[PDB]
Amino acid sequence: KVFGRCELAAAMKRHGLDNYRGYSLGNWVCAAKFESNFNTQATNRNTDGSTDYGILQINSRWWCNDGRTPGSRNLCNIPCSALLSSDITASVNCAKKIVSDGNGMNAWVAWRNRCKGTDVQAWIRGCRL
Ligand SMILES: [Cl-]
Ligand SMILES: [Cl-]
Ligand SMILES: [Cl-]
Ligand SMILES: [Cl-]
Ligand SMILES: [Cl-]
Numbered sequence: 838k839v840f841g842r843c844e845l846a847a848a849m850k851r852h853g854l855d856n857y858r859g860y861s862l863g864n865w866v867c868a869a870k871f872e873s874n875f876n877t878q879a880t881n882r883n884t885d886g887s888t889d890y891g892i893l894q895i896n897s898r899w900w901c902n903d904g905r906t907p908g909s910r911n912l913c914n915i916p917c918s919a920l921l922s923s924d925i926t927a928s929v930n931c932a933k934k935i936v937s938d939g940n941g942m943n944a945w946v947a948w949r950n951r952c953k954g955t956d957v958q959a960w961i962r963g964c965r966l
């Protein structure tokens with residue numbers, strides 16, 4: 838599923854991401870935009886052989902099981918495929934664990950490089966939230 842911007846903002850809010858670990862909703866929407874272009878089916882292979890899955894490009898190296906990432910963990914206790922669902926519950930719940938890991942949203946390189954410090958509120962402008 839390719840979410841609309843405000844559609845995703847609303848779903849993220851309902852799932853408790855607005856201000857989670859201090860990160861306003863616009864931060865989450867901005868991260869999703871640059872990670873996946875709001876596409877739940879987005880996948881991308883990393884150089885180390887791990888893969889990133891879903892709207893927030895969660896990595897098989899630590900967070901989910903895809904059966905093909907040697908030495909990796911599954912800290913969200915989910916198959917990586919669960920992160921590609923039209924229902925964002927699994928992605929959100931796993932994102933909550935990631936952002937709590939110590940480095941906040943810097944865990945998402947695209948958030949650090951493209952969202953951090955910018956006017957992220959623009960990402961939820963006009964949405965009925
Ligand atoms: Cl957009
Ligand atoms: Cl915001
Ligand atoms: Cl594996
Ligand atoms: Cl594990
Ligand atoms: Cl599994």
Ligand SMILES: [Cl-]
Pocket residue numbers: 848923924925926
């Ligand atoms: Cl959803």
Ligand SMILES: [Cl-]
Pocket residue numbers: 858859940941942
């Ligand atoms: Cl933080």
Ligand code: NA
Pocket residue numbers: 897898899900901902903906909910911
């Ligand atoms: Na894994």
Ligand SMILES: [Rh+3]
Pocket residue numbers: 848924925926
């Ligand atoms: Rh939902």
